[PDB]
């Protein structure tokens, strides 16, 4: 039986096997259709397939709500190459084409197998007629909500349009619903299940955050009389893990300020570890230079703002050290996780000072209240704040670092085996926190 899945995956989409074991399970449980389904994988862990493929293997049509026209086009083009008759009804569509597709959707055996559609379109009463005749003939095998996170106000990109989708799902009792996003805290997940009226049990396929080979720890800048030297020592332990090869691989140090990058890259260089500053302040050429130097391991350490790491794809990144705490636990996972891509053991470390925290907490309250004066009030302004607080907690609390990150993102207790300062030495991390008290 499962072969028709493998068969179509290969014969249509031209991959022999799935991208990850979870993609297989997700797609396979969408196939059965006995449960509604949530898929939460980072962009490009192959979420599209988890519905694009079952859509072809199902009796009737598969309708896909995607929030932007931009996103729809990308997929239509790709599906058209796979010789799939995929249609899109949106804002952008031509007066004649609109009426010509509507006619197609009315035919017994409509040419369309997969209909992509704006949430705007889905609510518009001008469309409800087409919807009803399809609902009537029970010609819906699957409803799919892409970018499910737009239903939540705690999401980064709430679209009111998406609130109406849940009522529609209930009208489509016949068919299972598939909901997908990359980004969902547990509060966003429950918001996604509630406001879409998904039918329990919901099978959830959620790419966990935990990575076996990464050792997270936190050091408290205020406890360290030679901080620049402590960072140097750290960078070298991490790079120095092939005694015969000397410096194997490279690492990143993340800073807030462009100033601090320039300054720190220097302090590190002089203290032993060759390092170059990267940030949007530099000339396009000087950047591509510093990247390339870092890339070919000519200069193994790069001190950068959140500019850097965007599509780097350097595998052997042995350390990611945050000189300044990050604006969000979101940001810290993304930043730190550029480490150890090749899967060889790596070190993520966060330099916490209360002095840093206060600066940032201040700057978020400014940038937020500045937003509330320009665009008025929002609920995602609280997620913005609580997102930072979660990371401060991570530093100010005793307890497994991977667990702490798993908690925030809604991942199951992770299999951390002496893979974080706390689990390795719970007492010494207590000793170090007890100490931060006395500073102030």
């Amino acid at each position, epitope marked *: 039986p499962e072969r028709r899945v493998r068969s179509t995956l290969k014969k249509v989409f031209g991959f022999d096997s799935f991208k990850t074991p979870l993609q297989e399970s997700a797609t396979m449980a969408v196939v059965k259709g006995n449960k509604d389904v949530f898929v939460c994988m980072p962009t490009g862990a192959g979420k599209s397939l988890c519905y694009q493929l079952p859509a072809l293997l199902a009796k009737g049509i598969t309708i896909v709500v995607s929030p932007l026209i931009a996103l729809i086009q990308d997929q239509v083009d790709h599906l058209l190459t796979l010789k799939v008759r995929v249609s899109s009804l949106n804002s952008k569509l031509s007066a004649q084409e609109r009426k010509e597709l509507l006619a197609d959707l009315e035919r017994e055996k409509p040419q369309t197998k997969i209909l992509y559609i704006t949430p705007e379109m889905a609510a518009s009463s001008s469309f409800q007629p087409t919807l009803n005749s399809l609902v009537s003939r029970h010609l819906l095998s699957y409803l799919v909500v892409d970018e499910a996170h737009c239903v939540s106000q705690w999401g980064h990109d709430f679209r009111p349009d998406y609130l109406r989708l849940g009522a529609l799902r209930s009208r489509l009792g016949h068919a299972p619903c598939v909901a997908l996003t990359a980004t969902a805290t547990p509060q966003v997940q429950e918001d996604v299940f509630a406001a879409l009226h998904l039918k329990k049990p*919901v099978a959830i396929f959620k790419t*966990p955050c935990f990575r076996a080979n990464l050792f997270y720890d936190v050091q408290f800048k205020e406890l360290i009389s030679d901080p620049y030297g402590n960072l140097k020592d750290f960078c070298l332990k991490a790079l120095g893990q092939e005694a015969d090869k000397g410096l194997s691989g490279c690492g990143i140090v993340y800073c807030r300020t462009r100033e601090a990058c320039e300054q720190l890259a220097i302090e590190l260089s002089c203290r032993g570890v060759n390092a170059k500053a990267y940030h949007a302040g530099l000339k396009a050429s000087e950047r591509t230079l510093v990247q390339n130097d870092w890339m070919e391991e000519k200069v193994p350490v790069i001190v950068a703002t959140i500019s850097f790491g965007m599509g780097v794809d350097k595998a052997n990144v042995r350390f990611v050290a945050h000189w300044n705490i990050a604006k969000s636990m979101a940001g810290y996972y993304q930043e730190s996780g550029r480490a150890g891509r090749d899967g060889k053991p790596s070190w993520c470390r966060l330099y916490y000072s209360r002095n840093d925290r206060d600066q940032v907490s201040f700057l978020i309250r400014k940038e937020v209240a500045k937003l509330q004066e320009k665009r008025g009030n929002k609920a995602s302004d609280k997620a913005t704040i609580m997102a930072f607080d979660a990371l401060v907690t991570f530093c100010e609390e005793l307890g497994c670092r991977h667990a702490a990150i798993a908690k925030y993102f809604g991942d199951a207790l992770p*299999a951390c085996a002496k893979g974080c300062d706390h689990c390795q030495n719970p007492t010494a991390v207590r000793r170090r926190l007890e100490a931060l008290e006395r500073s102030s």
Partner: nanobody
Amino acid sequence: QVQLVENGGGCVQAGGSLKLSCAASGSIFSINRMTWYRQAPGKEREWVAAITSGGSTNYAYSVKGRFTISRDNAKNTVYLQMNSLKPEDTAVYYCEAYGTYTLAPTGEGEYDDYWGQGTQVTVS
């Protein structure tokens, strides 16, 4: 799937107290709400009390000020302290875990509601 197990039921002289419990076992991350219900023989099920994540409580008027709903969220175990028991309180008390989020380290996980067998309360 998840085992809801009630405990602490019994007979008491009216005016007495009981303390009922609800252990949810399984790969549980969080539960939207746990609600205590009572069903007397051939009588409609009655909503007694509810606790959400963050300890937001909600109680029926029939019981407000006699009943107290606690949670050791560490033990994922909710309690109903029942003081001043009346014979009208006699029924089968059971919890529902509403919005129950299980997950595996693998990323496979289930959001479902889950219902206990019950425990008998009887008041002379």
